[PDB]
Amino acid sequence: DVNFDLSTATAKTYTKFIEDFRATLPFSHKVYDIPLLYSTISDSRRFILLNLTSYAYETISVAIDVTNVYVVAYRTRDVSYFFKESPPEAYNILFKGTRKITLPYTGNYENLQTAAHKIRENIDLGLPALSSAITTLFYYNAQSAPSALLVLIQTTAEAARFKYIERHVAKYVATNFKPNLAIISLENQWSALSKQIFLAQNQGGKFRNPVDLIKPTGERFQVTNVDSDVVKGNIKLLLNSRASTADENFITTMTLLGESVVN
């Protein structure tokens, strides 16, 4: 579990939150000396909660998946709501007693994109913007609600995914500024680059499949090796998305404590 107070949010504090955040969830292995999540972790530990405090000294709880680190749902006051097609398993571990409401929307950006009729490029961002997120959820506004939590995903879930996103979000501690196409392409590419990062181990620093993303400047560039700025101290925890071997459903599901056969 991790806690972040917006009322006392600060650039240095934002850094501590992301470092503690990557340390909060387990680690399947170490890639380039950095944390990472296997295909799936323990369900009891898969769901972690974040205690966030609005600049109004109000406190809410956010539940996210340890692997991709995306908010499945969140709890406000005594009511917690989640999307569909995946988050419902939340009924099992997340909220236990508080009210429960799942919006007809699925835990997908396209579903929220249609309801909000907006794009991340047109959504405001910045520490203070987070106040709008925590603040809006307390005043759950059908239209903003979707855009409110989305800001939280970009400021909390995405911030932990990359230190680069954390830097741009941490730079704003009072004003509000809309994101940039750099995070958009970078967000989708991160997944392809992250799995390739594990591959970078046997490529000496090259990717078998080159990666095309967008530099924070606002232009599109091609990255094919660790020499790129993204692989530098910009990548902390990575998504292993490793489970193809899980096809045999044995190296997994057959872990059978039998290992350590002795006794």
Report the alpha-carbon distance of residue 258 to residue 255 in Å, rounded: 7
Q: Do 138 and 77 form a contact (C-beta atoms < 8 A)?
A: yes
Q: Do 184 and 158 form a contact (C-beta atoms < 8 A)?
A: no
| 77 catalytic per annotation | no
| 110 catalytic per annotation | no
| 89 catalytic per annotation | no
Backbone angles phi, psi at 57, to 5 degrees: 60, 20
CATH number of 1-160: 3.40.420.10
Residue 210 vs residues 130, 189, 199: alpha-carbon distances, Å: 35, 11, 12
Q: Which of 55, 91, 109, 140 is catalytic?
A: 109
Angle between helices 163-171 and 11-24 (to 10 degrees): 150
Q: Do 248 and 76 form a contact (C-beta atoms < 8 A)?
A: no
Report the relative pairing of strands 206-215 and 219-225 from DSSP bridges. antiparallel
Q: 109 burial class (0-12, 13-18, 19+ CB within 10 angstroms)? A: middle
SS3 call for 160: helix
| 161 catalytic per annotation | yes
Q: Which method resolved this structure? A: NMR
Q: Do 57 and 72 form a contact (C-beta atoms < 8 A)?
A: no
CATH number of 161-246: 4.10.470.10
Q: Do 53 and 7 form a contact (C-beta atoms < 8 A)?
A: yes
The alpha carbon dihedral of 68, 71, 73, 79 has a sign of positive
Report the alpha-carbon distance of residue 45 to residue 147 in Å, rounded: 27
Tally the residues of the chain. 263
Report the alpha-carbon distance of residue 4 to residue 14 in Å, rounded: 8
Q: Do 162 and 235 form a contact (C-beta atoms < 8 A)?
A: yes
Helices (H) and strands (E) in the chain, counts: 9, 10
Domain boundaries defined on the chain: 1-160, 161-246
Token output for 34: 């950095």
Residue with tokens 């109004």: 56
